[PDB]
Amino acid sequence: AMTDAVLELPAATFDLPLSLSGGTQTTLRAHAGHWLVIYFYPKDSTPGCTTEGLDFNALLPEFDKAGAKILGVSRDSVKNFCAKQGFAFPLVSDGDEALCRAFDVIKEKNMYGKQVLGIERSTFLLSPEGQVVQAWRKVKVAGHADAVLAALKAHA
Numbered sequence: 001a002m003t004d005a006v007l008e009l010p011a012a013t014f015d016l017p018l019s020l021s022g023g024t025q026t027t028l029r030a031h032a033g034h035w036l037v038i039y040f041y042p043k044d045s046t047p048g049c050t051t052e053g054l055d056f057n058a059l060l061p062e063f064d065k066a067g068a069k070i071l072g073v074s075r076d077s078v079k080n081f082c083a084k085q086g087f088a089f090p091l092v093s094d095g096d097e098a099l100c101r102a103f104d105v106i107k108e109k110n111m112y113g114k115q116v117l118g119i120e121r122s123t124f125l126l127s128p129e130g131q132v133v134q135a136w137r138k139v140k141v142a143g144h145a146d147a148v149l150a151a152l153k154a155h156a
Contacts, residue, residue, distance in 0.1 A: 003155060007132040012100040014130060018073065018092035021083070026071075026092060034130065035068035035155075039123040039139075040105045043074055048141060049082035055145035057087045057120070066152050072130055074119060075100060096126065105137075125151055 014032075028036070039056070042050050056063070056070050063070060070089040075097050083091060090127040094100050100119060107120040121141075125134040125148065134151050136144070 003133065005131040005133055006101075006135050008110075009102055009130070009132060009155065012066040013099065015110060016098045016102070018071070018094055018095070019043060019076075020090055020092055024091065028126070031069055031071070032112075032130065034128055035066070035152060036126040037063065037068055037152070038073060038103075038126065039070070039121075039148075040073045040100065040103065040119050042122055043077045044111070044118065046082050046135055049074070052121075052139075052141050052144065053082060053085055053087050053091070054090065056148075059145050060088050062153065063150060066149065067121060068152055070120070072105065073099065082154045123148055125155070127155070 015027040017027060039052065041052060044063070050055055053072060058071070060070065069076070072087065072089065072091040074091070075077045076093040076095065078138055097106060100106050103122065103124060105120050105122045106117055109116055109118045120137060121139040123139060124131055124132050133155055
């Protein structure tokens with residue numbers, strides 16, 4: 001079926017702690033009951049974080065009416081302008097990369113000659129019950145938020 005899930009997640013993924021602004025935590029289980037757009041972004045790209053975030057933020061009202069919430073995910077790294085933007089949806093930190101690994105977004109990247117591990121910009125659409133109905137990996141930001149919104153309505 002064109003509505004079937006494209007990825008299967010370990011059950012424990014739904015209770016992994018994600019750190020919010022203010023310091024409290026949230027989980028995927030807390031988002032059960034409504035559609036959820038979960039997008040992952042790399043920390044090494046502030047401009048990309050800012051633009052992808054503002055795009056989803058501008059469309060938040062339509063996502064809300066379509067029955068979905070949005071969660072932006074990354075991993076706090078010792079090595080901020082995006083976080084200061086003030087998106088109307090939560091940005092969370094996956095401290096030990098547990099959630100990232102569950103979605104398999106940690107990939108080998110070339111950073112100025114040195115091979116490192118990092119987050120491959122990716123997005124996932126989950127149903128009210130947790131089914132991952134659609135995925136986007138190594139995302140092209142141009143038109144992405146619009147495409148995710150379209151996908152949400154197509155599954156509605």
